[PDB]
């Protein structure tokens, strides 16, 4: 399996620069070109440029050539994209990708997981995680609802899993909302049998990479 | 730039039904010498990177189901899903690789409707603030509206029977990958001091599947 693994989400101040990395594995690094594509919230995919991993040759969209440098390190099998003079319009998810590799032998298209860059004056803040315990007010019929409130963090994103990924059915992790304070908050909930609350264990796993926050919160009745 | 324009911006059909997405290019992308159209179709699901489905306008990538089909030549292209599977809920993007810069269409959001015309009332759950959060000096009250369809829903908060306005925030999930349903969370946030001056906390829910509003309530403590 070819994989592309990118660096973590960051907040950067307006006017500063950001450098995103993209580590490749599963193929001969020098054989293909890595592209950089960004996606601002709610907007379409936007191609920024490519770099040939072997010769280091580059091509840039006119929209970005003034502010973007794409580079590679074959020893580390990694490509980098540096965007300078950051502005609010640069807040976006940035992807590296082996786009449309059409070869005599095979065809493949592989993307990194994306890196959200937020351009803001605000400081990084890790979340508080509070249980949403199941109770008589959160059971209807034979179903019980329970969750975790992930409150007051910046920037986006957090990730939430349940029981280290063993629990996926019935989970709703809601889109975050920007509170009046300028910090984000979200809830993740799941519905489970009310009959088995005494025997099953429910743990929400919360990760906020920008603050290196890692919380496991047991949610008990 | 070769501008890629998709039509419609959003569409909704039932499981089993045919979905059609149109893409038009500002310039001819057919090369007469090799009879190839330099176009690809991608699928993007929430919070994931795009996935290649079609290339050369009509060639399915290996692994892609045969219900996905591309058609068209020159400036007029079409992506067809013959029998929609509820997972196909996603945003679809056209892409040209005829010339630089590489460009993408604006995207076509594909949603599902129920063919059996039925309605799903929300299940309503309410969560008082955790003692953990109360020790931090803040009180968040969470109301959960679970698995309702259609999407339009109303939540009102009542504190000591008095209707609330402008002090709550709501978030709605994307349509479920399996059942057409949506969920909504509403959070009422108060300082601990204001939380403690009131007895009754209630969220009242209106939805097409309810012939009168559902109120879920608790008394503080």
């Amino acid at each position: 399996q070819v994989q592309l693994v990118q660096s973590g989400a960051e907040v950067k101040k307006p006017g500063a620069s950001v450098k995103v990395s993209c580590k490749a594995s599963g193929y001969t690094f020098t054989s293909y070109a890595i592209h950089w594509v960004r996606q601002a919230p709610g907007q379409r995919l936007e191609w920024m440029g490519w770099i040939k991993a072997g010769n280091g040759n580059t091509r840039y969209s006119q929209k970005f050539q003034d502010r973007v440098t794409i580079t590679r390190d074959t020893s580390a099998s990694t490509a980098y994209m540096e965007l300078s003079s950051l502005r609010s319009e640069d807040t976006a998810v940035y992807y590296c990708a082996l786009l449309t590799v059409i070869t005599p032998d095979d065809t493949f298209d592989i993307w990194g997981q994306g890196t959200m860059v937020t351009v803001s004056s605000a400081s990084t803040k890790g979340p508080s995680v509070f249980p949403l315990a199941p109770s008589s007010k959160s059971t209807s019929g034979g179903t019980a609802a329970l969750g975790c409130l992930v409150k007051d963090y910046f920037p986006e994103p957090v990730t939430v899993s349940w029981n280290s990924g063993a629990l996926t059915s019935g989970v709703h992790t809601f889109p975050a909302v920007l509170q009046s304070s300028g910090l984000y908050s979200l809830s993740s909930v799941v519905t489970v049998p009310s009959s088995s609350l005494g025997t099953q264990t429910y743990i929400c796993n919360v990760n906020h990479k920008p603050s290196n926050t890692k919380v496991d919160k047991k949610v008990e009745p | 730039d070769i501008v890629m324009t998709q039509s419609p911006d959003s569409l909704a059909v039932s499981l089993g039904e045919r979905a059609t997405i149109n893409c038009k290019s500002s310039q001819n992308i057919l090369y007469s010498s090799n009879n190839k159209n330099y176009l690809a179709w991608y699928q993007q699901k929430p919070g994931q990177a795009p996935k290649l489905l079609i290339y050369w306008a009509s060639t399915r990538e290996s692994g892609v189901p045969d219900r996905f089909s591309g058609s068209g030549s020159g400036t007029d292209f079409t992506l067809t899903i013959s029998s929609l599977q509820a997972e196909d809920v996603a945003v679809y993007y056209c892409h040209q690789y005829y010339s630089s810069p590489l460009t993408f269409g604006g995207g076509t959001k594909v949603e599902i409707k129920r063919a059996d015309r039925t309605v799903a009332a929300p299940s309503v759950f309410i969560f008082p603030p955790s003692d953990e959060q109360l020790k931090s000096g803040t009180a968040s009250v969470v109301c959960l509206l679970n698995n309702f369809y259609p999407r339009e829903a109303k939540v009102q908060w009542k504190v000591d029977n008095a209707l609330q306005s402008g002090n709550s925030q709501e978030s709605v999930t994307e349509q479920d990958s399996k059942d057409s349903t949506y969920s909504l969370s509403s959070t009422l946030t108060l300082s601990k001091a204001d939380y403690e001056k009131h007895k009754v906390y209630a969220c009242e829910v209106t939805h097409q599947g309810l012939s009168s509003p559902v109120t879920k309530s608790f008394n503080r403590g």
Binding site: W50, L98, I102, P104, D105 | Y31, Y38, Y97, S100, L102
Partner: peptide, 15 residues
């Protein structure tokens, strides 16, 4: 005509 350098990953004579 197409620019073969638009996406170097694309061999225009491959299926």
């Amino acid at each position: 005509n197409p620019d073969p350098n638009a996406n170097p990953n694309v061999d225009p004579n491959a299926n």
